[PDB]
Amino acid sequence: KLGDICFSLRYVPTAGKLTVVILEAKNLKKMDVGGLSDPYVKIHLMQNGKRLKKKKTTIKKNTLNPYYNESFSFEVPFEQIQKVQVVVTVLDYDKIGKNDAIGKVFVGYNSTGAELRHWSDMLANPRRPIAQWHTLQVEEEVDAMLAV
């Protein structure tokens, strides 16, 4: 498995500002042989399949069920909040070597089910934040979904 990461959402149309708040990851896969992991979360703002912004949170050295509660801000127009998708990706850090991909979640157009409901709930609450548990899925499949 990959695990599950909880993150919040908060759109402000009055100003046209998108907000993504990282909360915590759990059941994260072990990337270190017989050891722990160093998973962190990242956020990417894509336009119906077009990379626009890239963000990353702190790194929880040696762990698999760490907390974050980080607040990120984006600049998405009230007319784009529906055409954009916030992708929450969790990657494992490895000092020198490259960072392994634990998994990644996505919310927005291409999204569906609990993911689409969250993004929609966000727009429904253009003032109050929306937190929910997002189960990290295979990044490759995730990228395949965004691809039309």
Residues that bind Ca ion (CB under 5 A): 31-32, 37-38, 92, 94, 100
The nearest distance, CB 54 to Ca ion, in angstroms, is 21
Q: At its nearest, how many Å lie between Ca ion and the CB of residue 78?
A: 40
CB of 38 to Ca ion, least distance (A): 4
Percent helix, percent strand, percent coil in the chain, to nearest 5: 15, 45, 45
Task: Kindly list the strands in the beta sheet with 84-92, ordered across the sheet, starting from the edge strand earlier in the chain.
Answer: 51-56, 39-47, 84-92, 100-108
72 CB-near residues (< 8 Å, 6+ apart): 19, 20, 21, 22, 43, 55, 57
4 marked among binding-site residues? no
Residue 114 or residue 138: which is nearer to Ca ion going by CB? 138
Q: Which is nearer to Ca ion, 65 or 132 (CB)?
A: 65
Reading the block at residue 141, the tokens are 């499949």
DSSP code per residue over 93-120: --SSSPPEEEEEEEEESS--THHHHHHH
With tokens 């990706």, the residue in question is 89
Instruction: Please check whether residue 45 is in contact with residue 84, taking contact to mean a CB–CB distance below 8 angstroms.
Output: yes
Measured at CB, which residue is nearest to Ca ion?
31
- Rounded to the nearest whole angstrom, what is the least distance from the CB of residue 57 to Ca ion in the complex? 16
Is residue 121 annotated as involved in ligand binding?
no
Task: Tell whether residue 94 is among the known ligand binding residues.
Answer: yes
Q: In the complex with Ca ion, which residue's Cβ is closer, 30 or 51? A: 30
User: Among residues 59 and 123, whose Cβ is nearest to Ca ion?
Assistant: 59
For the annotated binding site, the residues are 32, 38, 92, 94, 100
